[PDB]
Symmetry: C3
Subunit: 390 residues, 3 copies
Amino acid sequence: VLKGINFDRSIVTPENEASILDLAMQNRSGVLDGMTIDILNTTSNQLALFHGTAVLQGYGIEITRAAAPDVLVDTTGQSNETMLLCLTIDLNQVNVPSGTVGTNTYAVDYKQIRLEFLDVPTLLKQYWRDHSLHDLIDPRRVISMPLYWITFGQTGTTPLYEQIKSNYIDGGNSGNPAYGIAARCENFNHFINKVAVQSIPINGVANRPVSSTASQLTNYKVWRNPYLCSQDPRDKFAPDNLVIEEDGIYRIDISGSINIANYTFPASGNSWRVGGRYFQIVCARNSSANNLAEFGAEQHLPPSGVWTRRVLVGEYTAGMTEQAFSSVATISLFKGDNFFLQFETGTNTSRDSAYNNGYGTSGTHLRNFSYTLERVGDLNGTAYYDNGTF
Amino acid sequence: VLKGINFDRSIVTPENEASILDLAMQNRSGVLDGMTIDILNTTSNQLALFHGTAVLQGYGIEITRAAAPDVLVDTTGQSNETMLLCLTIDLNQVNVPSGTVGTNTYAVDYKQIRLEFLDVPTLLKQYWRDHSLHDLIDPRRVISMPLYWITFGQTGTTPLYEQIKSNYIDGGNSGNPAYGIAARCENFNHFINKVAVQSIPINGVANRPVSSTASQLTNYKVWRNPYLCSQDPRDKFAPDNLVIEEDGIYRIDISGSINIANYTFPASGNSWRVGGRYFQIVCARNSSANNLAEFGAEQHLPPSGVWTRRVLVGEYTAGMTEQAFSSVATISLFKGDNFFLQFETGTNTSRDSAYNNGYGTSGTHLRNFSYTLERVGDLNGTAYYDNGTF
Amino acid sequence: VLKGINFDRSIVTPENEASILDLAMQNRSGVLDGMTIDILNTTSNQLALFHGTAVLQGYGIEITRAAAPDVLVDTTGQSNETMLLCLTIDLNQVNVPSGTVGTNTYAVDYKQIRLEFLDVPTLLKQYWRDHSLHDLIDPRRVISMPLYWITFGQTGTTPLYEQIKSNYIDGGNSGNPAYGIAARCENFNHFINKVAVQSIPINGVANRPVSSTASQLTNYKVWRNPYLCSQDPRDKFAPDNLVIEEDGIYRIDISGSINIANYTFPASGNSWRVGGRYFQIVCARNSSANNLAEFGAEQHLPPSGVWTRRVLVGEYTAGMTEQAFSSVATISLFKGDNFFLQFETGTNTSRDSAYNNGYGTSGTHLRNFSYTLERVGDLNGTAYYDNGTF
Ligand SMILES: [Zn+2]
Ligand SMILES: [Zn+2]
Ligand SMILES: [Zn+2]
Ligand SMILES: [Zn+2]
Ligand SMILES: [Zn+2]
Ligand SMILES: [Zn+2]
Ligand SMILES: [Zn+2]
Ligand SMILES: [Zn+2]
Ligand SMILES: [Zn+2]
């Protein structure tokens, strides 16, 4: 029958308002404030955490402050292991109330909530990002959120820790937690290698032209949303590739210029005319490598016929020292994909190349180059096939 | 007096949390999951629907699963008619509870909820998109959401069905249901007709250059959000025009290049110089035709002085074989409007035309052309006049 | 201990659903409908306001309609002063219920809610935009939202009023209240002054080329979201500068063309070649002046190393009459900052200038110029340092 949830005679239940808060959170779970490690109160038998608030699939969880230590987690028996400190909801457990709402003594022992140590495969099997308490097809009773990588040493030592920033809603994303910017950078200058195909380094290090003969690897300001993407973990691909952590339709914006752009000089033989040289800037996706996503999670397989390369800018050099370009596109990306940008031209400098024979500032380079990658849509349901192939 | 809704001594009512869920839904109503037709359990006297969840102006509605058939709708008396299967809320009705919260027997017969067949004019008069239970000026007691076009044949036959996808929150839009992408496409190539003004086909079919003498109508990947826009229903305008289904401020992104671009050849008579040829790419809106919106609904009239054409790219050809362009603009669009893109140039190929005299690959064409149309703002209240004219 | 908020044995409190509604409002407070001044029922002793709804840090406030006047505020004792009419929540007060839920006589005198007159410094000390009832570090018990600037004259006169539009969620922003468009304009034409550095007027008045010898100051359609930005209050900077009212990551889109663009004419001395002229379009931020934000509020100080200028377009003129450009960038902006756009070129018209020696339509100018400024991300927590410098 047709059942009302929010109607005059309805009873508003706990799952109901949890389902409402989950909707209000754009189906994202995470720590809203605090819940960071407290090293001062951390020993070889206990791990301490500061007070804070978290939302796990619409259920509000709080670590209360008093007097510190705000909370203590038992580390006894954990040694010579890398574990995940997890916040877990277990709906098979029973919450035990005590006292009364009449007196001012009502209290609850929330046995449905746990702070625990799990190994990577156990967490993955009950990770909120892949499974749900509210799931249509496979509804779960136990769900977890990883907070920290905890590396325990020998018995009697305090452990090493690494925050799982993808599970903390810190800032930059308040208001649109499941969307917004994935990656962005400030303007940078990058030397064009004398090759037909090359990636543009989008991860914070560019080969900056410094003199008339030399270029040097120089850092530039870059930012990544750890919930949406991360720098490739393999050092071969780390300067150029992003790993996508979340499926969706993304917008890619690029702008910059090609400086010291090559062309065929106007001479009497070519009727005093500029011979333009073809170049293109492409964005690309690649899913050949599995397990690139956080925790080595299984990649989300793209639909059949999915794109791999897309031209953003395709034109000829125009005989000027510097020529500007700009491009904006929406593209489908999948969890576990590599995402990168490529510059493409011919290799014959006297005939078809957009680059010259010079080096450093005297050689062809990208100048004032920048990009923004933003999640703008999801790939749930029908969209996966209708919108996911391009 | 100043009344509190969420305060210590307040009583949180059903309309209250419905108003909260409606806000959390960005004032969009629709089926969240399931509620699709069940043909196997559909006869000539009954129409079956699968289990699912829907939100109608903040009221949660559920069709429960058990044993199938999840729900049955009476089709007796319906013959030789095209009807709308609607989910309706009727606040004039009384919900009948039974049993008790003490025993485990509390149940409700939600007579305020109906699955029914309505004709187009009846649905339009109580459609959630145009009228509201929460409305300030004209508050309603009965509101409906159309789910399927149901075409009943002769007495004794099973009917034909067409899903009303604008009223299903399937995917691509979870998290920002009233906004996001309206339309997007992959890169395509389109031959420029030897005319002064022409539309660029944005609906999935382009006139692709295939040989040195010929171009052929070729499909390209395109996607449309049915809640925001649809392909024009008139075949004359179907390859080029979108119909806007929702008012708002939209962002239009375009990029591509003009290939085999025409110019005046450098000769001794013009001092060995390139004679550039003017062209422009414009976006346009037109509201002369009423009833283009879904169900033939009345168009929303734009404010006085509203724009009709906007230049996105305006420049000269530069003497190169291929020249890239890009443009991004925010524009106001109204429910019932036609939206389209136009390429504009001169008609004299030896003097002012951006196009040449060739055909197919030998003729001037758009190459790597793509666009994204996105809803980025609404036109409610004051914005209608301050932001709605451009 | 781990406390549940939305769990089976939990008690859902007023602060809880207020915290839920605040999240659903993207942490924005404001009037949702009505609450505008009622001049007809306004005397020299009372100020009247129409019925309406407002949300203040998740608490729903309503002014009820009956018979008018919907509400009356005591103006006795207020004379020869500019005051702020404020809606205030005071959690130190006690809400007084009466009657019973059994009979149909339950009512509450919400003493925690006040409509009052405050001076600018008092409002600033308890303004919702800077302080919170839900705040982690400095939780407050009293918070206010300014609705109108009320200027009282001599005793016996009705006052003058100015609506505080930043605190009214009117339209354009329903669904994404804390984000969306900050500023946008229609295409305009603007004469390039014969200087090295100049601002592009983004506030609705351009110096439009009208004849072969003259340009004239002409209005163009522009829109600003008062919650996000305002026109600079100092007349020296009013045609060009915006004041940012809210911190965040913003997207800036620009497009247009440079018409009657200057270049070195091809002659026998330069081997019949076009000598390109360098120009750049930059966006800029400046925080040297404090108190530019609404109510003269203290500016939010940017992180150390913050950007001040960013190149959007950097290239040479290409020998054509008109050359198009486009650019999209994400930038950090802070409350109290000035934001503006600059056109930059050389000053020698016979050597390095992108502009010529002509005036009006015969002189170099921006044609079909437009922009969109949009808030796309916040700068809360860690983002302030990681994302706030660029
Ligand atoms: Zn649920
Ligand atoms: Zn996954
Ligand atoms: Zn976006
Ligand atoms: Zn309401
Ligand atoms: Zn309508
Ligand atoms: Zn948008
Ligand atoms: Zn709170
Ligand atoms: Zn402030
Ligand atoms: Zn945005």
